[PDB]
From a paper:
The Spike protein is a viral factor that mediates attachment to cells and fusion of the viral and cellular membrane, functions associated with the S1 and S2 subunits, respectively. One human MAb designated CA521FALA demonstrated potent SARS-CoV-2-specific neutralization activity in vitro and in vivo and had no risk of ADE. Cryo-electron microscopy characterization of the complexes formed by Spike protein and CA521FALA IgG/Fab showed that it recognizes a patch of residues overlapping with angiotensin-converting enzyme 2 (ACE2)-binding sites in the SARS-CoV-2 receptor-binding domain (RBD) of the Spike protein.
In brief, the purified extracellular domain of S protein (S-ECD) was incubated with full-length CA521FALA IgG or CA521FALA Fab and then the mixture was applied to prepare cryo-EM grids. Two RBDs in the S-CA521FALA Fab complex were “up” while another one was ‘down’, and all three RBDs were bound with Fab. The focused refinement on one RBD–Fab sub-complex succeeded to improve the resolution of the RBD–Fab interface to nearly 3 Å. At this resolution, the details of the interface between CA521FALA and RBD were unveiled clearly. Hydrogen bonds and salt bridges around RBD residues A475, E484, G485, N487, Y489, Q493, and S494 contributed to the interaction between RBD and CA521FALA together with the hydrophobic interactions around Y449, Y453, L455, F456, F486, and F490. Nine of these 13 residues were overlapped with the ACE2 binding site, including Y449, Y453, L455, F456, A475, F486, N487, Y489, and Q493. The other four CA521FALA interaction residues on the SARS-CoV-2 RBDs are no more than two amino acids away from the direct contact residues of ACE2 on RBD, such as E484, G485, F490, and S494. Superimposition of RBD-CA521FALA Fab and crystal structure of RBD-ACE2 showed that CA521FALA would clash with ACE2, so mAb CA521FALA may block the interaction of SARS-CoV-2 with human ACE2 by occupying the binding site directly. CA521FALA can bind all three RBDs of one SARS CoV-2 spike trimer simultaneously, one IgG binding with two adjacent RBDs in one Spike trimer, and most of its interaction residues with RBD were overlapped with the ACE2-binding site.
Numbering used by the authors:
A (entry chain B): 10 to 84, 89 to 120
B (entry chain C): 2 to 25, 28 to 105
C (entry chain A): 333 to 526
Write the structure that this text describes.
């Protein structure tokens, strides 16, 4: 949407199938016409870490929803993707990562 | 904490072996994604050597490194896009300034 | 009057995964259910049809043994009319079940140094499994409006998932080798007695 330059940010994605000991759920910016930048990953147990950006995102496997919030949205405009990491070899289940699509603009 | 990528949009012709460098100094776990224009980037090579569940277009998923002048040397059949690399050390889980193939 | 081969079902070295549970028909043999009930090793022995220590001298025309491996907390779902991801998408016992369910802990056989990821279960499925149905296909489940087209990605989940069995898990998260003996009766002479 065309969010106001200080209205809080809020995006959600649908994720199904638990938190089985190795699963990431990260969020990745993409400023328009520039390179990739990442914002936060939540591991399978509880470990949440970010960039020097003060994001406030949290996943929840019950209710099957990933949520990515923020506080200040000055001017940033980008395209936000929902990843799905598995950075641990689970036998047949190879580690992987897959992304959504979704945009945001300000004024 | 950069992942400097050298080639800066190398391109000669289709059907040729292109070598992209990742001259990052880091421990292991460096990943390689491919993003076509106007599309969501997708995983190609996760743990710097292996291959994800895919790349059936040249199947030349190449990773030869951990001495950290990392390289991907792959063919180019109808598979022109932008190519990115990603560190894994979990404070700056950063990306690289990827290059194109046109 | 040759003894039925329970040394090939219970004592087998490679138990099948739950989503591809092994199925063995047993017929034309005398069945000794006395080496089984009082073996004192099975953590779970629940007979949902004929009472356990009376079916020794009861004859059935076929005994179908379904062997697989599941977690400890998921052996309570091997019963007629249950829920979860094992009774729903992997192995559903019919509501008219007439047989026995046997389950013995296998923390000494199916738990390796860092995890025995060789056993999988069907985490995703469009519709619940009809009783005694077996869905071994690995088609990519779809969880959104976007067609999958056979390429796996977001909203296109790989249906299976791997048990992370370890020797140092909780009692629930330890493997339990499970054999479900389903007796059936038809309009044919009985071949399985005691
Ligand atoms: C498995 O084999 C052992 C000895 O080889 C035997 O004592 C045991 O009874 C067998 N299991 C069954 C279910 O008969």
């Amino acid at each position: 949407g065309l969010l106001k330059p200080s209205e809080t940010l809020s995006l959600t994605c649908a994720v199904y199938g638990g938190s089985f000991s190795g699963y990431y759920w990260s969020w990745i910016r993409q400023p328009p016409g520039k390179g990739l930048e990442w914002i936060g990953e939540v591991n399978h147990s509880g470990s949440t870490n970010y960039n020097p950006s003060l994001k406030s995102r949290v996943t929840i496997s019950v209710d099957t929803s990933k949520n990515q919030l923020s506080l200040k949205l000055n001017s940033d405009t980008a395209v936000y993707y929902c990843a799905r990491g598995n950075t641990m070899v689970r036998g047949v289940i190879i580690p992987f990562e897959y992304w959504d699509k979704g945009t945001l603009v300000t004024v | 904490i950069v992942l400097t990528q050298s080639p800066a949009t190398l391109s000669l012709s289709p059907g040729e072996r292109a070598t992209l460098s990742c001259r990052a100094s880091v421990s292991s776990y460096l990943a390689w994604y491919q993003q076509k224009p106007g599309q969501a980037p997708r995983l190609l090579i996760y743990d710097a050597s292996n291959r994800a569940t895919g790349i059936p277009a040249r199947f030349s998923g190449s990773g030869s490194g951990t001495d950290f002048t990392l390289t991907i040397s792959s063919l180019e059949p109808e598979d022109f896009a932008v190519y990115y690399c990603q560190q894994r050390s979990n404070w700056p889980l950063t990306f690289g300034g990827g290059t194109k193939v046109e | 009057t040759n003894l039925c081969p329970f040394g090939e079902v219970f004592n087998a070295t490679r138990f099948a995964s739950v989503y591809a549970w092994n199925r063995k028909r047993i017929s034309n043999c005398v069945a000794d259910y006395s080496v089984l009930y009082n073996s004192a090793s099975f953590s779970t022995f629940k007979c949902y049809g004929v009472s356990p220590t009376k079916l020794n001298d009861l004859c059935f025309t076929n005994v179908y043994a379904d062997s697989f491996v599941i977690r400890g907390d998921e052996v309570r779902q091997i019963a007629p009319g249950q829920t979860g991801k094992i009774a729903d998408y992997n192995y559903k016992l019919p509501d008219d079940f007439t047989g026995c369910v046997i389950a013995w802990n296998s923390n000494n056989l199916d738990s390796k140094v860092g995890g025995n990821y060789n056993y999988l279960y069907r985490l995703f499925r469009k519709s619940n499994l009809k009783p005694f149905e077996r869905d071994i296909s690995t088609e990519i489940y779809q969880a959104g409006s976007t067609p999958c087209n056979g390429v796996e990605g977001f909203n296109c989940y790989f249906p299976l998932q791997s048990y992370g069995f370890q020797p140092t898990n909780g009692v629930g998260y330890q493997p339990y080798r499970v054999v479900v003996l389903s007796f059936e009766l038809l309009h044919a002479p009985a071949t399985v007695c005691g």
